[PDB]
Design an enzyme around this catalytic site. Structure first.
Site, PDB file in Angstrom:
ATOM      1  CD  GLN A   1      -1.111   0.136   3.703  1.00 24.14           C
ATOM      2  OE1 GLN A   1      -1.527  -0.839   4.389  1.00 24.14           O
ATOM      3  NE2 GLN A   1      -1.591   1.279   4.047  1.00 24.14           N
TER       4      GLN A   1
ATOM      5  CB  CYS B   1      -4.781  -0.652   5.374  1.00 19.28           C
ATOM      6  SG  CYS B   1      -5.826   0.129   6.699  1.00 19.28           S
TER       7      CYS B   1
ATOM      8  CG  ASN C   1       0.067  -6.063   7.073  1.00 15.41           C
ATOM      9  OD1 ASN C   1      -0.891  -5.260   6.691  1.00 15.41           O
ATOM     10  ND2 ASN C   1       0.899  -5.851   7.881  1.00 15.41           N
TER      11      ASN C   1
ATOM     12  CG  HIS D   1      -3.452  -2.193   9.514  1.00 11.18           C
ATOM     13  ND1 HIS D   1      -3.353  -1.708   8.212  1.00 11.18           N
ATOM     14  CD2 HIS D   1      -2.781  -3.351   9.208  1.00 11.18           C
ATOM     15  CE1 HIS D   1      -2.567  -2.345   7.366  1.00 11.18           C
ATOM     16  NE2 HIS D   1      -2.316  -3.355   8.002  1.00 11.18           N
TER      17      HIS D   1
END
Length: 215
Positions: A19, A25, A182, A162
């Site tokens: 990102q 996110c 992630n 997040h």
């Protein structure tokens, strides 16, 4: 539910993305979930467009944050369910500024019809994931910047900040764990993944779990 699940074993999860310096996110979490649900509905695994959401979803706030549930709603209610391919609408916010939305020149890579918001209950989330696939979740990742591996059991769990993607779990380990994709490159964590302890609401993982619906 099964003692352990990992949707990577089905080839249902795209590669770890980056990102960059954009607070997008929420879009990576939502799109990663769509990508997996689209594959599990019987379609080829396809990289889909975070930039579409970052630039065009005006219910969320681009590089200044957003919510996966808002993103799923925007796709269905404002974009006719369509999610563009990443190849046709590539990410362009890595430096921290999102370009304005463009409506032309893109290719539809997936369609969703709605989304589900799951109970705030780790066992029920795990059971749902075991059958229905990866789940978008919000976490407190404020303590995650230097994680390099292991089962994180020391997660500051003060405030959601997040979005990430649950792809599996292992209830049989001495400290049971979630497996999380992630969006901070494969240089972070365990090739871009993190394991966090499961069963004590670590990182607030149970509080905002959801999934798009394909079909």
């Amino acid at each position: 539910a099964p003692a352990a699940v990992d949707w990577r074993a089905r080839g249902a999860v795209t590669a770890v993305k980056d990102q960059g310096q954009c607070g997008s996110c929420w879009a990576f979490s939502a799109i990663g979930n769509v990508e997996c649900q689209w594959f599990l509905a019987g379609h080829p695994l396809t990289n889909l467009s975070e930039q579409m959401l970052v630039s065009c979803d005006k219910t969320d706030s681009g590089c200044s944050g957003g919510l996966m549930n808002n993103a799923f709603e925007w796709i269905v209610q404002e974009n006719n369910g369509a999610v563009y391919t990443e190849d046709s609408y590539p990410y362009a916010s890595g430096e921290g500024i999102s370009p304005p939305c463009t409506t032309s020149g893109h290719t539809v890579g997936a369609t969703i019809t709605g989304h589900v918001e799951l109970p705030q209950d780790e066992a029920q989330i795990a059971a749902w994931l075991a059958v229905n696939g990866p789940v978008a979740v919000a976490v407190d990742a404020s303590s995650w910047m230097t994680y390099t591996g292991g089962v994180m059991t020391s997660c500051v769990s003060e405030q959601l900040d997040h979005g990430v993607l649950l792809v599996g779990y292992n209830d049989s380990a001495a400290v049971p764990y979630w497996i999380i994709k992630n969006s901070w490159t494969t240089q972070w964590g365990e090739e871009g993944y993190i394991r966090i302890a499961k069963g004590s609401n670590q990182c607030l993982v149970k509080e905002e779990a959801s999934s798009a619906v394909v079909g």
